[PDB]
Design an enzyme around this catalytic site. Structure first.
Site, PDB file in Angstrom:
ATOM      1  CG  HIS A 343     -11.542 -26.441   8.982  1.00 10.57           C
ATOM      2  ND1 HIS A 343     -12.341 -26.868   9.956  1.00 10.57           N
ATOM      3  CD2 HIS A 343     -11.729 -24.949   8.570  1.00 10.57           C
ATOM      4  CE1 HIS A 343     -12.720 -25.468  10.369  1.00 10.57           C
ATOM      5  NE2 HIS A 343     -12.586 -24.579   9.629  1.00 10.57           N
ATOM      6  CE  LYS A 534     -14.828 -40.765  14.300  1.00 12.60           C
ATOM      7  NZ  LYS A 534     -14.290 -39.676  14.691  1.00 12.60           N
ATOM      8  NE  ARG A 535     -19.742 -37.522   5.275  1.00 15.43           N
ATOM      9  CZ  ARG A 535     -20.030 -36.752   4.330  1.00 15.43           C
ATOM     10  NH1 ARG A 535     -20.377 -35.356   4.579  1.00 15.43           N
ATOM     11  NH2 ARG A 535     -19.725 -37.010   2.959  1.00 15.43           N
ATOM     12  CE  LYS A 540     -13.089 -38.174   8.966  1.00 20.37           C
ATOM     13  NZ  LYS A 540     -14.177 -37.741  10.014  1.00 20.37           N
ATOM     14  CB  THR A 642     -15.949 -31.546  16.920  1.00 18.26           C
ATOM     15  OG1 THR A 642     -16.522 -31.646  15.786  1.00 18.26           O
ATOM     16  CG2 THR A 642     -15.097 -30.009  16.679  1.00 18.26           C
ATOM     17  CE  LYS A 646     -20.043 -32.780  18.028  1.00 17.38           C
ATOM     18  NZ  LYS A 646     -20.348 -33.443  16.629  1.00 17.38           N
TER      19      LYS A 646
END
Ligand SMILES: *Cc1c(COP(=O)(O)O)cnc(C)c1O
Ligand SMILES: *Cc1c(COP(=O)(O)O)cnc(C)c1O
EC number: 2.4.1.1
Lengths: 801, 801
Positions: A343, A534-535, A540, A642, A646
């Site tokens: 992952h 998101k985390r 990120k 992911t 969405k």
């Protein structure tokens, strides 16, 4: 809403009857004292009853039919709520809605009572949850196996702009879906030592920790299939202290480690990993028996990352030590049974357990790991004679001050298939990360681009969008998302354009009402909902988004009279407890909003809010109400993603880098329908080659310079001027994710976003072009691929009686 | 059996239906995989459903009617199993028996699956359980309040003749009777400090422990009344450790302290006591509100010993600190609300908490305790001017190296009624123990001779005896045991004599089958079943019984050819973990059996066995099968006893001292129908006055001398000759309970027991004379007395709709 099913008169009559029956017999309440919570539970039990018949018939059917069984081992299952999902998949939503209405209740009010089954950190956990749903919908005899954490991902509270962590007591009022199975409890061993006798090795003098299974139903989409998710709970096997000390062994399944993509190395975490593996495999070996040459023909063990990697030596331990198979046959069986899913490429996520810790906790496993390594390397040496460094690089054992075991290496060596979670990620695994493993066994490496379930992520969270889509193309797309492509035919349809826009505004009004009701936060409904959920991690780049927000603020102050598309910038996500930077970042976000949100010059033209406690159920509320989806990870850092999928399925336009699945999403819809920007992996590499110098960007960009000085001087922290010195220092001198490097392109790209938003008609037509091409990202497609390309079983949408 | 009710055709049809419904919907099983355990649970849920209607109607009725409410606070509730008891009280036994039979199941096999709710140590705990049953049967709005221990009294295992302690995991497969009520959770405070402001005291900076209530139904005997037993469970209010550390606060309700009549002084025990008191009183104050002058008219708080004594200062804390009542009015309310029940005179049982421990854990309570003491002593001084030592003796505060608080003194001072548990015990409280308190307030002291419920202890455990009794006098005695007196009319009835004897032999054959089935132990069915079952303590003198057993053994060896009535001597009971002597005694019992049971000369003429894990459910098996009931405590040590009552109600003849309730049992049946022996309290006192010299007895009794030398030399411990040196030493020089002093009379008395057993007809006629006069010892009589003499409410056998 027609996708919600029929409200049969008898069905509604029976539902109300059973609702009242449970209120009386199960909850022992009357309508005089009943609270909404009691009402939620009465309905939950009523809905749960509808699963039982199929649940028993399905498992019975698998016994009679004897298909190959898929065991999905994961340390996380980010399930979210179960009531609506159950109603949707059994076609009972409208009936229950009508029944509860007739009883004078608002079913949606009741649904808000349910606690999220937040047994996951983020993407990895959620993928397992979407996978269970798709495997059921695809008629696979699949079994989800994990651990029943007493406390899932911590509930985040924002206090003084800072994140606060609270225990996520999700079982406080019970869980009406799971079925405890104390009768199927199995023993798991820890510590001890190995005795090599005349019958081989024997693991003795161990401490026992019992594993109690709790089974939860997993309903497929209207095919009458109900699979099982089995979660193990830890149970203990002067006097008072001894009874109290039972807590120690039971602490194994107490709480989910809140780290996202970061290896810690805590022994308790290792115990949790073995705990799920040992118990799960006992279940597998036993089921199989009710010989070993056909094991791989009847068993598939999928490893969700390296967390359950211990199943490889554990399976070997069982077959050799307990079943008496010779090592070679046992290994052949093992490799053909196991498959590994990688992952992330970020190095600090890799599990490298110190050999001493493995030697102490699982002595027999380390011995098997060493034997696996020798023979594996022996194979490498025979394939590449004289290539000594390749041997050192491929070894399962890592040298250093502390000798460790590379679990990823163990997984590749012990599985017949290894896959990345998006094309770009899978390619780099073969190119760089596992280049050596790929050269030795090219056939092992695959790609299985991630996906999300169209049930929870469309029909469930966006009934309005699912309705207008069904109005034109029917309901078949629900479990055949590629049919969404037929929607390209409506890009010029005035009705569809009107409706897509109408649905989005309804979702936005709803999310606005939620924030007003639950947090008393008022957001401007006629603003662009710019969302990054998101985390919280540096890769990120929530910081890049922060820089942009400040840019918008400074540009407004410089030219107040200049019109700008109104924006409500929403950032949400949890920071791992202990990750100082990630928490400083959450504080910067609230700190920026403290200035921006209160500047009279700005007014409602720009608002920055931090969405508290982002979780699956919140994702279902905010995503369907988003206009712009932020997926700005540094190229080459996000394996797949992911959340991006969405947002695309729900009518939002995406602004992001060519990273992870973003690449395949742009390809599916056409790069012209995506707001792509910044560096590409190749560009990142070139910067790395010559060295990333943030100063250059600071020196050459006056607008960026201004923001760094505002942060530095204390403009966003007047009471504590030096509050963000660490964020500034990291950006200027230790930024591994090159925030400054993509600043210019990002701000420019956002300008184009606003430009398009100014044209409602074209915004919506581009949205339609996005929804119409999101089909490839349904988890049904991903799972079907896993089934045919790795597991060796044929999926089926065929209904059971 | 007619006392078991009707097996209506529709009732049986509905039962089977619901049994199958639960197997499917509640247990999620089919008959292909269902185990007896599943079957037990399917029936348990089915039976539990029958309680719900009345459970809700009863509590509703109490709300509508508003009678005074009785709160029975106890740290223990020795409930035992619930399935049969529920069936009996609802008249569903035969129907369920028939329904399960038609389903091809043996209901009794199923009943053996249930776990005892062993939340008690012995007498005190069991009395609370019998009381709940009687209070329900007597139509009282009574509420049992305690703590839901995760682990009750340890399950005892006999390994190598030694007692082994194992956790009593009674909730492992769940509890189908209780109803969790997380919604009614209340906060309990610990530690902290007191702030005296301008509004009075304020308890601040405390650590919170939440109390989660679990409600269990308490069915009265066929009157449609279903009261409630509320048990509180402890719940918590870097990151990982903090979540794990939640265990500490939750440990409060983890396990029942296994001490019988022995004060330890463990802080955790004190926390458990306050925990139940604080939560319970919050429930009480709130219920009352849904003013304080009428509190005692609507509330009765009965304290089962001093364990919940903290309710006195706690009630004061609430009324003064939170309700703002002036101290004097608050105290008037408190005393009139509380009543205290004393259970023992043995000094090491008294609770005397070090003031420092109370000051730290409950600072505000100690302050209130000191204030209560001052005013109380002020009253004593005004009643007895100049009597300074009386002040020192009556004080709630005890001087010494460590200052302590006498909880018994606190209870007497804070209650309007104080009672002993048997006439002899209640008299000595007024005579000696609380002589000073009695002189100050004579009206406070009462007696409430203990009792046992005729439901569990007759109809439940002895359906055969209950049947033959009903055949002659009807069923009315079941909740009117004094009617058993009509049986004196059958002392010469050949049929009744035949039947009483027949029933006893059936019970003995059954117990023999149990021991053979579960432990593979074979006992001679044509032997006198001589049973002593109760907690293992020195004052109960299991050692005296041991001396007798050895006497019988030595007498057989000396005169082999001499006929002696065959005996199977059974001793059972648990020893407190850590009580070295009590455990040495259990070892002596098994050690004697190791010699005796294997001597070929003795054969089946004498057998000594130790009944493993004596508990409520075992008591229901062995007591109905006993011929001789051993109640040989040293005169003046056993406050009342209840096991004696069970044996009398079940057809056994008693051999005992004039102690506790033994005295009232002999009086009820006639001393000529009881095997009374040894010292009377007066005789014990005279020995104490001149000093007990065990040597004298050793010197003057050759048969006793022989036994002491056998123990000493290692006759009963050949491999470890000095194994019992401590028992011998204690007997010879430190025996506080004068075992030797009652040896001669005891052996002689047993001779008379055997003599009568040789005459079956006269044995049985004397038994009849016992059963016929056991009526006074039904807990319905005791409770009615509590109701009218202390609580101030009128009992009623009247049925609810
Ligand atoms: C889908 C999901 C994720 C993954 O989001 P990404 O942006 O891909 O990291 C994380 N958390 C929750 C609550 C989700 O639903
Ligand atoms: C009745 C009972 C007791 C009390 O017995 P005594 O001989 O009075 O001490 C103790 N334990 C159990 C299991 C009981 O049923």
């Amino acid at each position: 809403i027609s996708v919600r099913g029929l409200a049969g008169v008898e069905n509604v009559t029976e539902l109300k009857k059973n609702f009242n029956r449970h209120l009386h017999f199960t909850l022992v309440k009357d309508r005089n004292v009943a609270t909404p919570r009691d009402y939620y539970f009465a309905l939950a039990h009523t809905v749960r009853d509808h699963l039982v018949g199929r649940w028993i018939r399905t498992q019975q059917h698998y016994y009679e039919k004897d298909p190959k069984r898929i065991y999905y081992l994961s340390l996380e299952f980010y399930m979210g709520r179960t009531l609506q999902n159950t109603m949707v998949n059994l076609a009972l939503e409208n009936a229950c809605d009508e029944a509860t209405y007739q009883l004078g209740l608002d079913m949606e009010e009741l649904e808000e009572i349910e606690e999220d089954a937040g047994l996951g950190n983020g993407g990895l956990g959620r993928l397992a949850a979407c996978f269970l749903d798709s495997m059921a919908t695809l008629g696979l005899a699949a079994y989800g196996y994990g651990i029943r954490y007493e406390f899932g991902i911590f509930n985040q509270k924002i206090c003084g702009g800072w994140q606060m962590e609270e225990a996520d007591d999700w079982l406080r009022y019970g869980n009406p879906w799971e079925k405890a199975r104390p009768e199927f409890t199995l023993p798991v061993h820890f510590y001890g030592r190995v005795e090599h006798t005349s019958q081989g090795a024997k693991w003795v003098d161990t401490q026992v920790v019992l594993a109690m299974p709790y089974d939860t139903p997993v309903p497929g989409y209207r095919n009458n299939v109900v699979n099982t998710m089995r979660l193990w709970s830890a149970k203990a096997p002067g006097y008072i202290q001894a009874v109290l000390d039972r807590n120690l062994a039971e602490n194994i399944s107490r709480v989910l480690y809140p780290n996202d993509n970061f290896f810690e190395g805590k022994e308790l975490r290792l115990k949790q990993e073995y705990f799920v593996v040992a118990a799960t495999l006992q279940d597998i070996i036993r089921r199989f028996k009710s010989n070993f040459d056909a094991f791989p023909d009847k068993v598939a063990i999928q490893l969700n990352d390296t967390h359950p990697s211990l199943a490889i030596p554990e399976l070997m331990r069982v077959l050799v030590d307990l079943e008496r198979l010779d090592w070679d046959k046992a290994w052949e069986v093992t490799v053909k049974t196991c498959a590994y899913t990688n992952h992330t490429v970020i190095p600090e996520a890799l599990e490298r357990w110190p050999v001493h810790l493995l030697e102490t906790l699982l002595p027999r496993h380390l011995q098997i790991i060493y034997e696996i390594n020798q023979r594996f390397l022996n194979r490498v040496a025979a394939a590449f004679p004289g290539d000594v460094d390749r041997l050192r690089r491929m070894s399962l054992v890592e040298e250093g001050a502390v000798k460790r075991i590379n679990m990823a290496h163990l997984c590749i060596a012990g599985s017949h298939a290894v896959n990345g979670v998006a094309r770009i990620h899978s390619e780099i695994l073969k190119k760089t990360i596992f280049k050596d493993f790929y050269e030795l066994e090219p056939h092992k490496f695959q790609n299985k681009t991630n996906g999300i379930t169209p049930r929870r992520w469309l029909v469930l969270c966006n009934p309005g969008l699912a309705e207008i889509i069904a109005e034109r193309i029917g309901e078949e797309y629900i479990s055949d998302l590629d049919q969404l492509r037929k929607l390209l035919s409506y890009v010029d349809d005035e009705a569809f354009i009107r409706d897509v826009a109408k649905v989005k505004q309804e979702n936005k009004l709803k999310f606005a009402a939620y924030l007003e009701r639950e947090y008393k936060v008022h957001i401007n409904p006629n603003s662009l909902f710019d969302v990054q959920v998101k985390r919280i991690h540096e890769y990120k780049r929530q910081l890049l988004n922060c820089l942009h927000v400040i840019t918008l603020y400074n540009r407004i102050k410089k030219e107040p009279n200049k019109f700008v598309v109104p924006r409500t910038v929403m950032i949400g996500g949890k920071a791992a407890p202990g990750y100082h930077m990630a928490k400083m970042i959450i504080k910067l976000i609230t700190a920026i909003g403290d200035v921006v949100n209160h500047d009279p010059v700005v007014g409602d033209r720009l608002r920055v809010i931090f969405l508290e406690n982002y979780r699956v159920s919140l994702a279902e509320k905010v995503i369907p109400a988003a206009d712009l989806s932020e997926q700005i990870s540094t190229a080459g850092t996000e394996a797949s993603g992911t959340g991006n999928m969405k947002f695309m399925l729900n009518g939002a336009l995406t602004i992001g880098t060519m990273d992870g699945a973003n690449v395949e999403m742009a390809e599916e819809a056409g790069e012209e329908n995506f707001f792509i920007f910044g560096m590409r992996v190749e560009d990142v590499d070139r910067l790395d080659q010559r060295g990333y110098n943030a100063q250059e960007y600071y020196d050459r960009i006056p607008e960026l310079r201004q923001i760094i000085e505002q942060l530095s001087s204390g403009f966003f922290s007047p009471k504590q001027p030096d509050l963000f010195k660490d964020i500034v220092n990291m950006l200027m001198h230790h930024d591994r994710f090159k925030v400054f490097a993509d600043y210019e392109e990002y701000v420019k790209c956002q300008e184009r976003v606003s430009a398009l938003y100014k044209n409602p008609r074209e915004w919506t037509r581009m949205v339609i072009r996005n929804i119409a091409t999101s089909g490839k990202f349904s988890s049904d497609r991903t799972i079907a691929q896993y089934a045919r390309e790795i597991w060796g079983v044929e999926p089926s949408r065929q209904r059971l009686p």
